[PDB]
Each structure stands twice: as C-alpha cells, then as structure tokens.
Amino acid sequence: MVYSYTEKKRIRKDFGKRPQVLDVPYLLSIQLDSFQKFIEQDPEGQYGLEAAFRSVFPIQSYSGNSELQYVSYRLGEPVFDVQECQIRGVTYSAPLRVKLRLVIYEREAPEGTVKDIKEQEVYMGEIPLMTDNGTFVINGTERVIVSQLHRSPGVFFDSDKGKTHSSGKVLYNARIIPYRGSWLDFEFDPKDNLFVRIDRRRKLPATIILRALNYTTEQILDLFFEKVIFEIRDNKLQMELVPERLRGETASFDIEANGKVYVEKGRRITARHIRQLEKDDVKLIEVPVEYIAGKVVAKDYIDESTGELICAANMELSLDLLAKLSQSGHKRIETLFTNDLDHGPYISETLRVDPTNDRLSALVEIYRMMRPGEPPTREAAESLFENLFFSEDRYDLSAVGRMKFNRSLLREEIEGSGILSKDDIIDVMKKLIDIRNGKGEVDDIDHLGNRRIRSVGEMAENQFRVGLVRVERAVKERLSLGDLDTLMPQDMINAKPISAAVKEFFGSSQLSQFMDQNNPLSEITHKRRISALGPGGLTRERAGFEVRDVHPTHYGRVCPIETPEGPNIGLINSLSVYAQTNEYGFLETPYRKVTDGVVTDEIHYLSAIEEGNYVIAQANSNLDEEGHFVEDLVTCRSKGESSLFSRDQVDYMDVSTQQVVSVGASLIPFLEHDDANRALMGANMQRQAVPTLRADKPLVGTGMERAVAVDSGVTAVAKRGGVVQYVDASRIVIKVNEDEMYPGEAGIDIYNLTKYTRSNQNTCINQMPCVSLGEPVERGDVLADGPSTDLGELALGQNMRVAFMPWNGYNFEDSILVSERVVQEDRFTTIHIQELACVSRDTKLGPEEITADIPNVGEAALSKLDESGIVYIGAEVTGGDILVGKVTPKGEDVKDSSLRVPNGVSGTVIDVQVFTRDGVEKDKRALEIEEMQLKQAKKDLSEELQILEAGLFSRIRAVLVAGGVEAEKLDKLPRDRWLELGLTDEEKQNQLEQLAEQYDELKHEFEKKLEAKRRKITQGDDLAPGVLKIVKVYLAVKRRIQPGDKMAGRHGNKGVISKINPIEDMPYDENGTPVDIVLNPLGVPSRMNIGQILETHLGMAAKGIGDKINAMLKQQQEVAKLREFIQRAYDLGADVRQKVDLSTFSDEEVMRLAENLRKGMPIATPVFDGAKEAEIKELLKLGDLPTSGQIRLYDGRTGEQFERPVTVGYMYMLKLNHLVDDKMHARSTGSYSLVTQQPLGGKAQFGGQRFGEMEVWALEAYGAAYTLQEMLTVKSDDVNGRTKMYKNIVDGNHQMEPGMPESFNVLLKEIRSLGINIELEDE
Amino acid sequence: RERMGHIELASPTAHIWFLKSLPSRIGLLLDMPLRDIERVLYFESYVVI
Amino acid sequence: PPDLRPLVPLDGGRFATSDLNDLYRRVINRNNRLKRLLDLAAPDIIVRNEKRMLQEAVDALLDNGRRGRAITGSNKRPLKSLADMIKGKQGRFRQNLLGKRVDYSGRSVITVGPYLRLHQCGLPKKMALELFKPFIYGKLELRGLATTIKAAKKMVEREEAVVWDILDEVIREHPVLLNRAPTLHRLGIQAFEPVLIEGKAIQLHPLVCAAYNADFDGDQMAVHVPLTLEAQLEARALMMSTNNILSPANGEPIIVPSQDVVLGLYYMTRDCVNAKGEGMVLTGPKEAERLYRSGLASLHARVKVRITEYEKDANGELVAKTSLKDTTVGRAILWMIVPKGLPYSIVNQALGKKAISKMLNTCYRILGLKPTVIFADQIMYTGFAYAARSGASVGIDDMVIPEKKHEIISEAEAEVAEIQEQFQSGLVTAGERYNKVIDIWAAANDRVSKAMMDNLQTETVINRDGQEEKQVSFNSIYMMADSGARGSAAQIRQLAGMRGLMAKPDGSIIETPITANFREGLNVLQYFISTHGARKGLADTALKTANSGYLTRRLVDVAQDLVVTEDDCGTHEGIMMTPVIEGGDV
RNA sequence: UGGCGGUAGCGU
DNA sequence: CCACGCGGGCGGTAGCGTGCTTTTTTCGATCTTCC
DNA sequence: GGAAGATCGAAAAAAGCACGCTACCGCCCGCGTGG
Ligand SMILES: [Mg+2]
C-alpha cells in the first residue's frame, strides 16, 4: 500500500495479525461536532440557537396586543484572529446579529391587522467561537469545557435495597425527572400504601394527585383495578368466574357446578383443578353469602326508592350492608379483585388514607403542601397545579426524556409533547404497581444506557436560554408599560445580562478548566475527558462506592484503565478510541455485523441498551481467511455476561482489539502483561511529562502516536499538497500543485511557527521544521513538529539503555540511579518559561508612570534598564533584579513600586509584551513591537506580491513578444519599462492596457490590505478599568537532571534520582559500552509490570538492528546489501499485517530510510494484538544478540565480573513535572500574618512549614514538652518571644521565654466581641 | 489589637446563640415553644406581658 | 479591634474587602436609620419594619445563615461572620490555634542514602545554610569576622568559605526533626544528626523508611530545627531514632531489614554442591574473605572452617570456644560483622527475612542496644554490598510456565463441559451447576499452582563429581519469593500460574476464570474483568483515608487527658484473663 | 516589600 | 451631570428544591388506661 | 367514657465529612439621587 512522503522517511515495523476494518476516527470529533451543531442554522430547529429562539420567542406583552418574534440570526466574522487573540490577550468571540421583527397589533381589535411592523437586526451579544484545535480562547487563555455525564431525563423505576425498612421488605419508587422542572416521585411505604412526593417535600397520598387530575373515585377504581361481577339472581349468588382469578386461593366453600366437583370446601386449589375449570369454562358459579365479605365495592350503589346510597365506593362489604343491598333490589354487585400477590390492593388503601374527597380539596391540599403558611385559594391552587406539571415553560421534558419515557413504558411512540400528560402519570403508577406485584424488574442507575453525556453545545444552549428568559422578562415588562409607537426594537433588548451569563459560563463554570499543555497526549486526554461533576451532577465527597465502579456496559465506551486516582476516581473517565455519541446523547460503539458464519465488513454503531440483546463476539477470537470462526465454541458477551457460545448464535463482533482502552492508555506497549493499577497510574504519569529539548522517537510503540500527533494541533499539518519553496526555522512557504489553486489565487501557503511560547504549565512550546527545501509534500503530511514530537510521532521521553540489578543499595526501592553521561548529553534537560506582569494602574492621587530614573536606587541595577524603562531582551538577570521601573505618586514624592525578580528565580528574558489603552501615549518599545509586526506582515504581503507581479509581467511579456517581437530589447529593458512600452493600434495595446489596469488594481488592493494590517497592529488593546499600561516579561531557564527529580517509565515504574554517578563507575559489557541507568528489579515481581521486561528485551533487539544498520553505514556498503537487510528485517514475524516492499522505493528513499533507522528501528505493537515472545527471540537472533535477553556485565567500580547474567536493554523513560528545585523551600525569619502574627505558607511567599495537629499529637506521644512549646509560642506567633529568641540565639544563649501566644489573645478578643464574658481570673 | 468599642443599639435585640442553638435557652427559660418565640421576636406577632 | 479585621492594601488604590467590616457597616447604618426614624416619630409600621431588619442585620453579624438566608456580597456566596470562622475546620480554634505554621522549617523530596549511619540524615547545603542562619550569625559575631548583624548577613549572602566552616561547626551535634505530612502513628516524626551533602534532596536512612511508611517515589519530608538546650536534649534523648527500637503498639522491633539487604544476605547463605572451592578447609573468616576476593572460590561453596564462638556464661563473662564447623564461605564472611555475643547457629541457616529479624532480636536481648545499632549498620552495609555483587536480575526466561498447566486446563474444560451437559439435561439446576463450576475451577487453580511451585522450587539439577542431583533452584524470582524481600506466593501464582477466579463488583464470582499467565498475553475480556476488582480496591482505599483520619481524630480527642500520675493504686481488683477460643482453634 | 477567600490539580 | 450612597440576590404573585449518614428535637396522629 | 399520658412514626433541623502541596481568579459595584 502506498506510503505518504512523511511515512517513507521512517516506517515503523508493526506486529499483529488481526486486519483493521475501521481506521481510528478524529479524536476531537465530539467537541467539533457539538459546536458545529450548536452554531449552525437548523431549518427544523431542535438544535442550537435556533431551538432556543423558537422556544423562547415570541413574547406577549401581557395581552397588550404587541409582540416581537424571531426572524433570523447570523454569526459575524470574528474581529481578531486566533493567533491575534492569543497574543493580545482577549476573548475569541463572534457577534450574534439577530434580525427580529416587532409588530404592534391593532388596539381595540383582538384580530385587527398590525398597525406597525419594525424589523431590524439587533446586536444581541457576542458568543465565543471554538478553534479547529478543539479549545476555546477566553481572556487570552486556552480553556476546555469537558463533557458532563448525567442521568437522562425520564422515568427511573428503582427500589431501596431493603435495609431502610429493617424488616426485610423492599420499597419501590418511580422518579420522573425532567430536563427542566420539578421532580415527581411515587414511593411505596412499609404499610404497602402508595405515596406521591413533589420536589422532595412532605409526602402525600397517591390518590391526591389523581383527584387533582379531575378523576372520580370510581374512575380511579376502574382504572387501577380489575372488576368482578356478583349476581344474586336465581337465589344462588352466582358470580362471573375467571379461572385465572381463582389461582392460589384456598377454597372457603364448595365450588362444584354443573354436576362436576372441581374442588370442594377445605381443599386448597390445585393446578389440575384450575385446568378442569378451564375445560368446563363455566360462566357463573354459585357462591355462599359468607364468601363475599371483605371485597370492596367499586360502585357507590344508591337506592332509587330511598334516594340515599347503600354504600360508598371502595368500602369493605358487610352482612348488614349485603342485606341492605338485597332489600334495595340491586342484583349486579361490583367488587374489586384483590389477589394476595398477583394484584395488591395498594390503591384502595391509599384512597382510604386520602382525606380529600373532591378536586377542590385535593387542590387546596396541594397548594398548602407546595406553599406552606399561605391561605388556600381555588384560583391560586389551579394556577400552581397547572404551572407545576402542565405548563410548557415551567415543566419541559426533553426529546431524549420523552424517548426514554416512552421506551420504559413501551409506548412504542418515540415522539411526544414536552409537557407531562395525565395518561403518562396513569401508566407510570400502573407500571409501579406491576413492579410491586412481582412482574417486571427495576432499572439500574449505574447502567450506561440510563446516563447520557452533555457536550459543550447543549450546556451553551441551556445558558443561552437562561439569558434569553432573563432578557425576555425585561422586554415583556417594557412592552407592557411603554407606548409602542416610534419604538426602535434595539432598546427593548439589552445584551448585558445575556453577555454576562455567556462570559460566566465560558470563563468560570465548574467544567470550563484551563487545559494542561504538558504534551500532546495531555491535551488529547483533557479534550476527551468525561466528568460526572458540575451542575446537575455528583459531589466529590458524597459520591458513593457504587458510582465509582465499572459497569459491564462500560465496554467499548469508557476506558476501565484511564481514571484519575484520588477523590475523583470513578467520577472522571476517558472516552474510548472508537466510541462516539448518538443523536440523543447516549454513547455508542462500533461493531461488525456477522452474517451466517462469515464476519462481514459492515459497521453498525450499537448503543448501550441494544447491545444487551444480541450476542457480541470477541476481538481476539481466531478467524480464518474466509471469515468463519475456526473454533466452534467462542467466548462472547450476552446480557452483560461473559460466557461461551456456539458459532451459529453470534451476531456481532468487535471492530478492533484496542476498542476497550482509551487513547491515553492505548499508548502503553505490552499492556496485556501489566497489572490494572500499575497500568492505570503509568498512563496517569504518561499524561504528565515535560517536553525535552531534543525529542527522541520511542523505540517501542503502539502505532497510534502518528494519529495522536496528527489529530493534536502541536504539529503543522499542510492544508494543500505542493513543493516547499522557502524553509526556515520561523516560516514555511509551500508552492501548491497545479490541481489545488483556487482561481485568482497566489497558490502560496505561509505557515508561521510558534517559537518558545509559554504554556499553561510554564513549559516550552516550540516548533521545529522537519521537511527540507525542495521536498514535495501532500495534504495531511506533517511539516513542522511541535513539543514532544519527532517526524510526526509522539515522543514523550527518551530511550535509555537501562539494566535491572541492585547497585550498592542506591536503588534500594523504586529509586533510580542515573549515569552522568545522561547529564553530559542533556537528554532530559527541559526549558521552563515564566511570565511576570506589571500594571500601571491609575490612582486617585495620580497615575503611575514607567520611567528609567527611580528615587534612591543603585545605578548598577539601572544598567539592565533601557531608555524606555524595560529590561533589554536577552539579559541574564537573577533573583532580586529589577525588570520594569515603575513609580507611584505619594501622599502629602514617588514611591518605588517597580516589579522585581522573585527571590530564587533566574533565567534569560526572551521577550516583553506591552498593552496600551487607547489614548495613552505609546512607548518606545511599543513602537518597536508594532514596527516588527508590521515588517512581518509586509514580508508576507511581499511574498504574495512577488509571485503575482511575476505572473502579470510574464503575461505582458508574452503580449509584447507576440506584438513587438523584440525579445532581446524586452529582456534588457526593466519590467517597469515593459509596462510603459507601446505597440501598434490593435489588441496588442488594448490587452496591454487591460492588463496594466489589473496590475494597478492588484497593487491598490494589496496596499489596502497592508493598511488594514497596520491598523490592526496599531489599534490599542482594551484594558481593565483604571489600568493604563501593562508590561509582561517572559523569562526562561534550562533545568537539568539533579538528584531528587522524578522520572517514571510508561509501564508505571516511578521513583526519584538517587545519585549522578560518574560514568567510570557504571557496569560495562564486553564491548565496554556503559550501562547508563540502573533500576531495581525488586519492584517487578510484586507490582505486575512484566511488560517492562519484554519491552526492554524488544528495545534491545531494536537497537541491535539499528547497530547493524549503523555498521553498514560506516563501512560505506552498497545500497543492495542495505536494501536486502532492511527487507529481511521488515519481513520478520509470523503472519504480520504489514507488508513492506523495499524494491518499490528508490535508492535515495532507501538511503534516507537507512539513515533514519541508524539509531534503531521503531517497533509498533498493538495493545492486545501484540508481539509474542517468539518474535522477540527471532528479532534478537537477527541482531546476533543473545536470545535469552541477559548478557554478562562487568563491574566498573571494582573491575570484577558479576556472578549471574543481568537483564539489559533499551527502555523508554519520561520526565515527570515534579522537579526538585521548585519543591525545596526553607525559611528562618520571614514575614508574618497581620491577624495571627504567624508565619505565612507557600514557597512563593517565602512562608514556613505547617505544624499539623497530628504533629502535636506525636509530640505529646513522646516525652518531649519543651519542643512543643518551641513549636507553639516562641517560633510561631509570640512577637516578644520571637524577638527575645532571635537576640538570645545571636548572643549564643539558648534560653527560652514562654510568653503568651497572640492567637489565643485574638480568640479571647473575638469571643468577648460577642455576648460571652470570657476573661482572666486574678489568681 | 486589644482595644474595643461599643455600638449603642436603639432598640433591644436578642442574642442568637441562646435562641437558635437547640435547646433554645430563651425558650426553655420562658417555657414557651421555639416557633412562638421566633414569631414574637421577629416583629410579626404580639405577646402579652 | 480594628487590627483583627484589617483592610489589606491591595495592589494600586484598591483595598481588600473584609466581611466583618461590611457586616459592621450594615449594622451601624441600620442603627443610624432606626435612630433617625425614632427621632422623627415615624408611623408604627415603618419603625416596626426598621426594627425587624435591624434584627436581621444582628442575625447576619452574630451568626450568618443560622436562621435563614445568609447575607451574601459581591461574591454571590455567604459571608463570614464571627461564629462561622470561630468554628469549623478552617476556624480560628483548630486552624491557627491547635496547629500553626512555624519558622526554622523546610520541606524537600527525599532520596535513599546507603552510606548513612542509623543516627544520621543528609541535609542539602542550601537548606542547612538557610535554616541555621541565626546560629551562623551568632558564631560569626563571636569569631569577630563580622562586626555587626548586617555584615554577617552580607557575608552569608556572599557565600565565602568561612561561612561554610562556621555552618559545619554549628551542625556538629545539632539534631533536626524530620516528619511526614500524614503523621499517623507515634513514630511519624524522628530526629537525626544531619550531615552536609550536595544536591537538592534530603538523604534518608534506608532502615528508618519503613518506620516513616514513605517510599522513595516522590514523597516529601519536612524538617524542623530546635534551638533551645531543652529542645536539643529532647532531640538527643527521645526524638532520636536509636532510642526508638520497639514499636509502641505491639512491642515488635520497628526497624527491620527489607528488600535488597535481605536479598543480598540470601545470596550470601545459599549453598551449591559443585561450586568452585568445595572441600577446602580454612582456618578463619579472614582466609575465606581472601579466597573469595581473589576469585579462587564462590560464595555458595561448602567448606569447613575453624570458628571461635564467644558465649556468655555466669557473671556475664565471655568464653571462647574454637571448633571446626562445616558451613559455607558466605556464612563465614557474615560471621565477621556478628558481635562477640551471638552463637554461630544464628548464622548457619538460609538467612531469610524472618531469620534476620530473629537474629536482630536475639542480639538486642543478649548484648544490648549499643552493640545492636552497630550490628544493624554493619549488616545493612554487607547486605547492600553483596546484593550489588550478586547481580540478581529478572528476565522473561526466568519465568517458567509448568508444562502440565495447559493439559490441566484442558481436562478442567472437559470437566466443566460434562457439568454443563447436566444443566442441558435438567439433571442439575443452574445454582448447583454454577457451584460445581466454581469448585472445579478452584481445584484446577490449586493443581496448577502446586505444579508451578514444584517446577520452580527445585528445577536446577547439578552434577556433583558424578551422577546428577537435586537442590533448591537458583531462579531469581524464586529467590525473591523465598527470601521474602518482596512478593508473596499469591503474587507469584498470579505471575506464572493463573490469575484465578475474579469477582464481579457486586461480589459474585465470575463463572469462568482467567486461564492465562501474566507472562503470556491476556485477552480483552480477562483484563476488563480484572479492572472491576482493581477499581474496587482503589476506590476502597480512597474513601478509607478520610474515615480513618476522622476516627483517629475522635480517638485522640477522647483519650487526650489520660496521663500517668501515680505509682500504685493498691487496688486488689483486676480483670480476668483467659486465652481466647472461638471454637476449633486458639 | 502589603494576603483573604474561592476554584482546579498533585502526593499519601 | 458627576460624586456619594447603599445595599448587594437571582429569580419571581416565592423560595432557596434534588442519588450521606447520624443524632436530636418536635409534632401530629394514634393506643391506651384510668376521675 | 371518652379525655390525658404514653408511644410511634414521620418530619425537620443540626453537624461533619484525614492531611499536606501546587497553580490561578476575584477582592468591588451597578443603579439611584443632590448639588
Ligand atoms: Mg510513595
């Protein structure tokens, strides 16, 4: 298969045998798709701003015959570019211009024609746009909004686990939850009586709401209960017998009929007896009067002669009541069937408990319950009940909510109204009664089908709707009170509240967080992270054990491995590689349809609910070439259970082996040989790895580093294929091919790299070109790598030739000994960039001015300062130095408030940025920065001008040589002289003029563009109120490896550096090569990270291959032998999916590949379709290294020989962002707090360590008591004690004055500030 | 740090620690329900002296 | 008082807002408005509302949010009144009163240092310079190098050599206290005699790490410096780690050799059969060391040496007995550091972790603490050195999978198939089928583990001047397993046997087990099943930390008062004591 | 050389 | 037409509403034992 | 002979929720009157 030009440079030897049927999709698909849906026009609405506009608008002005309605909306072009927004420090936003139409209907006529129609486009705020990178730019900072995971709206029929009642009886509750509105619960009590709870208030009898729904007691009785007819006709009391109604009831009489004794008195009913009844199917059976005693009568029977009712509805029958019915003459008695288990009479008892008897009484009770302390009003109760449940604006079930509501109740109709109907409540309570009766099963909240993910678009739409109703109230009241004439619709709508709400959501929400730019994997994981926190979600501390478990439905959607350890475990997860989102919002996973025995290539996206019905095959299940399963009995998943199934009864197969793990966890090689905890925390530390100044390719990889690098925006991916024209460390110029220029276009692509830009974690973000001049490129190929990227491949750390053996106890436990050669090559040195800010705020006493001369300051310190007052670029200032000279007006000269370098900080100043408010006089360095930016813009414009002018002058030259045919005179003459050249009077002159005018138009247009760019650069930036000039200085420093630094491998091994041992003490092999890093094997057997060893072995093999290649490069061998060796190396393996053909590559391509492979051949091993040990042994045999993986090391310290062979090999190791220099802090006599006179806290504030309460407990545990008094009073907060201690220590006397702590005095004074009289007794 | 001042309230006011910290000291001493004491205190209900 | 609610001067003309100041301003405004209304004789309704809202302001000031809504501010969140920050976790009573930040303190990440004695710790030069600054100032003033404190400060920031010499003199016997952030038990904080070292990390003694429960994976130590003489004597007497030898919970020793140390001792006590130098007769451990260092013999060789054992008799005198014993050369080397009180039988074993602990306990009981500390330092040194010389390593070839295992699995499958067939025929129910499946798989797991252990323990076969013979294997993983340095039988079973029967999060055992070793590949389903238990345990610990801390705090508060005040009560009443028997075992 | 709250993350 | 001031709450005919657990108090409703 | 003491059960309120460390965001403020 044809390889891209960026891939031909280095081809990764990939193991694995399972072919891929679906390539890795766009990792950032969720965010981009959500925002595209949110910000695009939708003809059918129901998505984004269109849905909110249609739901909110129009607004009726309190029956004022005047409303305004939505017409259209448009998103304006952003004022500033993404790079411009980042540099300037403003929010990347776009205007929201909405064309609206206010109409004033004719007064005195409800249907009269509109008198005036005012239609206009109103600027209703600005909304933040999202970049291609998948991140938002708020206030000049890159923030990311994670996707929340919340319970889907609808009906959840669950139950308590049974411990609440303490008697072993469970209680079932159905909770109807809306997208917006009040929640409604129907719960069973220990007394088997239904109850209704609204918004977690005091419970009420369940029939109260039924009465409020204008349902009579007879209506409820016949709705929620079956009916039995008793006939006292023929003096036999014959009743309509249903054979299923007689199941499981002991006979209280003789039920013989038609001369057949089915079952007699004293005999419990048997299934054969019920069968005999079915065969006889007798309509009516004679009954004694005693049998119908406890049956409740559904119909409130009334005697027509007397005019009074014999018995009320739902009343238990009585012998006197039966006699009254008999003497009344009624023969058709109605009873409610009450089975002990099949049909529980809960509704009848609930109605009996209900005190309310009419709709008005029930509504009054509801009003009292919802609004305690207020007198009941019929109209008020009606309004409250209608608004609570049956109002469109208050209560609104979402489309997903309605779908879940109908699916749970098997309504079969997916579409429905947002409001809740009476039939919905009826069906919900009927299903709850069915669950109580013993049929049906309760749902599981932890099931992934009952939880949905809300992306950025949905939350943005909700916040927009909240702002819309907030401004809707204002426009409603303004239209209601004000006269509608000459009213210009701009001033009804005020954009301040909506804009404030949008800004608050995008800059201070619970889920909008600063992204971590440590390495591209970090941004990818942060953009693909799903959290359960935020509004409408769980709390960090009151989460519960059940919600932090992994459900069997998490397969293929949520990675069981990647999860932040700590209080957030379980609550935060990472999306799977192939997982995507359904339209309703539920996670879905790809699957391969299995037809007959052959697995086809068709891909179906199965959701969580529907996956539980079919039988899912296994990714690792063996498959033949035809497609059948070579094994009849294959492992499969069905109904959330893993079991063996036959060949015929399987319907779907996994798309790929790596379908389960996330993007972050999939980058761990040999993951199947690692423990879950070890792998989890190894991926966690892989997320945090600072970029080194030289990125080195990982020798052992999983193959998706290319995809991760390409999808992440750190690289510079070309948009159009072509040939490089001008390559440089700053800019790249691409001359696109003949197929890919739009008409009237230069065809020149200018890619501007970012060099040494600060990240969100004070880490370097540098871009280095990888292509060479004249190298052809195609669209999608990488042009310049970013941080931790090498040739378009993710490179978090470095390949170290490590060994596993104890070394004098320096690697006592999990501690790493690093050779001094690592420091020599600076393989782990990292650049850190810090930013300091100085604000020239304007005070009432006077403004602040940045000057060079400062009162009473050393002139030596002013040397670093310039005439403008800012430090020169490239200075080597250290701790205590001054960067910007600022003075502030004093009371009734100027006080020196100039920004100074924080103590313990040094480095080199790389750049300075200045922001100036409009009207404030520009500074000199501001002019220099503006002219530099203008020069860069003019250089780009001239890069376009040269090609455009060359084309135009070539055309005029063709015209001239066609007409004049003085080629020699033309070429000697300048092109400007060609322009003024005249010819004979025909098209030779007409077309010449028509081309000269186009040249002039092009020049004028490009001058206009230059003027626009100059205006954009020159325009002053907006600042905070009271601020005049802001100066930001960026320093940078190289941090090298020092003892105490934390270095961890990919597989999970952690630790800190113990000693920078000189290279002469390292163990050396027979060839004399140093063994570099030495680890401790003791951590291997316990913490299962065996994938280390294999990887190490594999790494060694890889290096050996590279070694061989390097040899063939050093001896100047011909291309034939190199090609043969590379082909043999690539062909190694058994049934590998990769088929690299070296013959098709040219000699130059083969030489380039060999040059790039001289430092070892990168190896790709899939997560679960990895390379077996046999392949590793064969690769080691190819490299002539021993197949056991262990060599004989010689000690360098003593020169002896180790008794046993040790394991050595090349392992990938990272550098954690846990440096030691920024963690050490020490204080002797620092500052103190104003209120407690106690030492401060934090390294940045030069504070002191906190003596915790357990420290005091331990001090009391020992017999030390003077040390406690030292910790408590003298050294912390006794100011007299502190001064006396300092003076005595200076004098040398180590004597103590106890004193009185000031914190106790503070507490005494504050308690006395209340009504308490805490004081001191004189004795 | 050890100097305090006094605010002269125009009308008497109840201390809240002795009122809301169950059991209510004011209510226990007066032998009246807490709700009645709260209603009387917050200038909405009248009490006979 | 005004200083207790200060108006912090923010950058520029802005002043930091104080909640107490806002509440007091509200109360004063309300009182002034009420006074004005009363003076003007306002209608009863207006003054009534004014009094009610004054009462609400008093509610806000005294205890915000106690009655109803808490009065908020510009932050849209409840403000802090007196009561809220008097109480609570962040309240003045338990945040700045019961535990407070102190001066002369520092913190830094730690690293292991082997060349350090039991009573010593490694302090960075910068940390020692900063922490002991007043002592250096005083010593410089006494020396006359600096006339005033300012001159001493300038000399310190200039970093001459005289300041380094003064610092070295100061630290000579000034102990410093080191502690961990989660100090749980009594041994959480201990003092050491610091020594100046390079680098930027605190070097810590390896043996005491188990006392701190602090692995060298990025943990940070906190250091405090006593000044007064009483505090220094507390450091030398009770803060000292040497005095802390027995745990206060059960009396067992707290310091215990572990990890590489014991591993080295294991390699110094295992005996081969045909090792170089077998049959040699030596006169003493010195000649054994000579032979080993010269390369003429191996540590596992079996020889006969003349040992002069010193034993304690009546009146505590030492009696020397010389005998030609049979042992290994490594044991002879180990005998060099053994003091003159222990018998030779304490060394003539395989020297496991428990053997080392028993030897240390016997040494402490017989010869006392002072020889015991030196003996512990010596055994640490010897174990580290000989573990380095051993060159023990873990490799993929060291991981031997028993040959029968696959066959066993096959038969197990056959068995389960038969049982499954019964459930197809209706002979047995689903529950009994599942129970029999679980029992069969457990039996298969036990058989596989036994076969793997038999394979690993005695795999090595060696010629001994003739026919082949068996001996305890030299496989590295078996060394770590038997010596007890790190790992257990269950972990080695998971490693080279089978993972076992995993469990669903609810607690139910999965019907099928994980039949693949960690050495070989694991399919997706088995990894997914294991993730359930992994997440279960991780979440268990995460939620366990907080409850453990709360229980510890409550227990500490309950028993804070109890101290020993008298010698003997004279009471004749006491509790009964009998061995606890639950039935079938004691 | 001015620290008070809040938010997020890290190590046990 | 700016500086003090004031009270500071969003949301809405008000009420603070949502998958923790334990302890204490209160209050209404009922069961029961006597004046 | 049917009310007052005792009980019960549900509701409502209070109280806490391990320890260190790191980073950043808001510490005014917006609407209503008197010179
Ligand atoms: Mg640790």
Author numbering:
A (entry chain I): 1 to 892, 912 to 1342
B (entry chain J): 99 to 147
C (entry chain J): 246 to 831
What wording appears in the published article?
RfaH, a paralog of the universally conserved NusG, binds to RNA polymerases (RNAP) and ribosomes to activate expression of virulence genes. In free, autoinhibited RfaH, an α-helical KOW domain sequesters the RNAP-binding site. Upon recruitment to RNAP paused at an ops site, KOW is released and refolds into a β-barrel, which binds the ribosome. RfaH recruitment requires a 12-nucleotide (nt) operon polarity suppressor (ops) sequence, which induces RNAP pausing.
Here, we assembled an opsPEC on a fully complementary (c) scaffold harboring the ops site, an extended upstream duplex (up to 14 bps), and an RNA that could form a hybrid of up to 11 bps and elucidated its structure by cryogenic electron microscopy (cryoEM) in combination with single-particle analysis (SPA). We show that the formation of an ops hairpin (opsHP) in the non-template (NT) DNA strand stabilizes a swiveled, pre-translocated paused state with an extended bubble and a 10-base pair (bp) RNA:DNA hybrid. Consistently, while in structures of hisPECs the RNA:DNA hybrid adopted a half-translocated state (RNA post-translocated, DNA pre-translocated), our opsPEC resides in the pre-translocated state. RNAP is paused at U11, and no unpaired T-DNA nucleotide is present in the i + 1 position to receive an incoming rNTP. Consistent with the exceptionally strong pausing at ops, opsPEC undergoes particularly pronounced swiveling of 5.8°; TL is unfolded and the β’ SI3 domain is in the open conformation. In opsPEC, but not in EC38, the TL β’R933 forms salt bridges with βE546 and βD549, an interaction that may stabilize the unfolded TL. In contrast to all other structures of factor-free ECs, the NT strand is fully defined in the cryoEM reconstruction. Bases G2-C9 form a hairpin that rests on top of the β‘ rudder R314. The opsHP stem comprises two Watson-Crick (WC) bps (G2:C9 and C3:G8) and a Saenger XI bp (G4:A7) and is stabilized by positively charged residues of the β lobe (R201, R371, R394), β protrusion (R470, R473), and β’ rudder (K321); G1 forms the most proximal bp of the upstream DNA duplex. Accommodation of the opsHP at the β lobe/protrusion pushes the upstream DNA away from the β protrusion and against the β’ zipper and clamp helices (CH), promoting swiveling.
